[model samples]
Target: PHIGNYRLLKTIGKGAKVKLARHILTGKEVAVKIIDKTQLNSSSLQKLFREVRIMKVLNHPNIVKLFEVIETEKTLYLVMEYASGGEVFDYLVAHGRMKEKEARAKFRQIVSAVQYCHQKFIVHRDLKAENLLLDADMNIKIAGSPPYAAPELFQGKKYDGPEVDVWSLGVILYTLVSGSLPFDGQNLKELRERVLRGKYRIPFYMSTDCENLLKKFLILNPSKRGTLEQIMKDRWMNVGHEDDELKPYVEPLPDYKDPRRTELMVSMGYTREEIQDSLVGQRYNEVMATYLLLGY
Candidate 1:
């Protein structure tokens, strides 16, 4: 089937309020949001427009790219960058909580991307675990949440956008380690009540630094919520992985283990550890190891 230039290929994913259909386009196959307009109430309509507004305004590596929008009286179409790796929460559910290093690394992209939106004065009222998608490259791409929107949205009170985002990012951060929230809520109303109360436990598994960083985002009062600048410089964000290496490949080194061989490998953009590991694998035939490591 066809919705404008986006040819419907297959349904790739679904959310409580949104569905994704693989569309044939985007140089690299894209996914388009299929939203139902028939049952839309004012709140849903507002959310739909708000989502459209947010996606097109702030374009960041971590923010989901909205390539095109379509309307045909009964339905709304949002063509977006397809995420082949699925949601981070989904991955976490399978793997349990991630290693501290990897968790913080994944979260840096989320916070930084939100910071990017904050700089643009566009706030995402809903930031949740489900909204965090991993593209084919396994990079986090944020997809906004509607049903779990911020408390200010429920109260119909005027609110600061970034602060609103802080609350939700806090919610997201809580999930990044804990995987599920530690609250008792029978429904959305009770959940929102629990959310605004701001009373919850940070598990032993999370470090003090992580808890402290979370506090900045989880403030009950938006006025006092930590700014992205502060969160950017926070210790948690500063924690990086030892093996999070991404580099251009290098050519094979000569079989000789000269003292300068390490320097030559380093100059070739290979790490000392990489050269060492290659030696363990290939022994005197280190050039073959270098080729294998760099080529892969």
Candidate 2:
């Protein structure tokens, strides 16, 4: 079905019902994440609100970019910049544990993301492999989930903003090297105890330096956790990458939102998706839009 000027191509993700869509005239892709209010409980709804709040407040190279937000009575449509490369977790499942060379590069991007968020005084309460998506170049872009929520969150203890990020980075780093969560819930009962005690295992195969890098972040005391600056200076993370010079932020584009113009095209028998797209491309000239729709 068509949603405004974008065509719903196919569902590219589930849970929140993410899809790949395109501008009908330009044919350029954008990702849409649908949130059905009826399907969400109060707690989930609150998180959705919080996510959107933070979405506007954040912009970083490694972060998933939020383009526009659309709302209806019972739904929300978050139009996001499409990361053509998808999730790192998907990549790992297909290819096995990431090699240290590649892992180092991706990890550096994650840390850079952490630094950006901290500099802005926003702590991503959840950071996991699933949240670490890849862009067209396979460079890791931050995305997804509340699973990496810190222990302090569960305990009702007050914690500093960036500190929870430290905990999540620990989990993400472990997942990157070990290909699974460090304090996962398969053993949640015991895992709860272990995590509260500030204990999470590092696989033996990880180099000593890498293990130490993760270990410092896993410290339970938010006051005592390793800072992003410390992690950035760590030997493994500082290895310069080929794409280091690549631009970290994508510039926003103008998306023409003309409901009446859209209605005119649909009434004139053009597919709903192409109207505003052509309007945008034609710079919103109604005469030209009509001509383009009419093949003039």
Candidate 3:
């Protein structure tokens, strides 16, 4: 205990070359991420420093809390508040898609977090289901998910960080309600083309407000995308709105718990294990570097 304040606990998550530990002191649980020295480079180290600095400055209930940092000659440790609930992707996949009311609750939490980030000029370059975490009460956290990342990110174009976050949020909402991606291609190039052209359609069953929100998010011009504040003020967000008659669409297929759900997901071109692995392998330093440099 170099700090002589916190005691290291057992490991929770293992990455390609990094390990995530937990600590308990004063009856508080904290996640301690330890990176190996061999993998540390000047650029990666700088990115990590930037992340710590950024996290320290930003605080919101929906955003993951960065409690402390400790840098030693051999390891870099980031201590974050422990989020007991698993990743948001698991919840969506396990339940197929949520009802309208439930979806609204999840979306509201995420939007709140994103709005806070944008207010601070921080862009979550990666916004996807895997990057999002949930609390025991099912509150959503939006951060990163490569599959739902903004089109500009894949095209190697410089974009407003906040706008990019909005785009990803739109994708997340679409994926949740539709249970599928709006744009799909064999490779990044093809996907970029689809995204640039706004080649997506709202499902017939989607509520008008939901549809409108999706349209705003899927705009080809990122500058025109609706801001979080504007979205929060949207009519659909208000339950008392008279025109909001869109009913929640129930899945025609069998329950997601059935073995057939895996087959169905595969048929739609998604692998549960693959997605989970990607989430587990996410590196904050690498993601931030990509955001800053606009490259992988």
Alpha carbon lDDT of each predicted model: 0.66, 0.71, 0.63
Name the runs in model 2 displaced over 4 angstroms: 38-43, 144-149, 153-156, 200-202, 240-296
Q: RMSD in Å for candidate 1, one decimal?
A: 14.2
How accurate locally is residue 291 in candidate 3, as Cα lDDT from 0 to 100?
A: 20
Point out the worst 10-residue segment of candidate 1 by lDDT.
287-296
lDDT of 3 at 197: 75
For candidate 3, what's the RMSD? 16.2
Candidate 1 lDDT, 196-275, residue by residue in tens: 67677878888999888888877776677778777677767776633433221122343534545556557767577756
Index of the highest-TM-score prediction: 2
Writing each residue's lDDT as its tens digit, candidate 3 over 141-223 gives 44224457676775668965688878888888887777777877878777777777777876787888888778777776777
| Models ranked on lDDT | 2, 1, 3
Reference-based TM-score of each model: 0.68, 0.74, 0.72
Predictions: Cα RMSD each: 14.2, 7.3, 16.2
- What is the lDDT, from 0 to 100, of the residue 278 in candidate 1? 50
The numbered model that scores best in lDDT is 2
For residues 208-235, write the lDDT of model 2, one tens digit per residue.
8788778777887788877887766676
Residue pairs with clashing backbones, model 3: 126-144, 128-145
Better of 1 and 3 by TM-score: 3
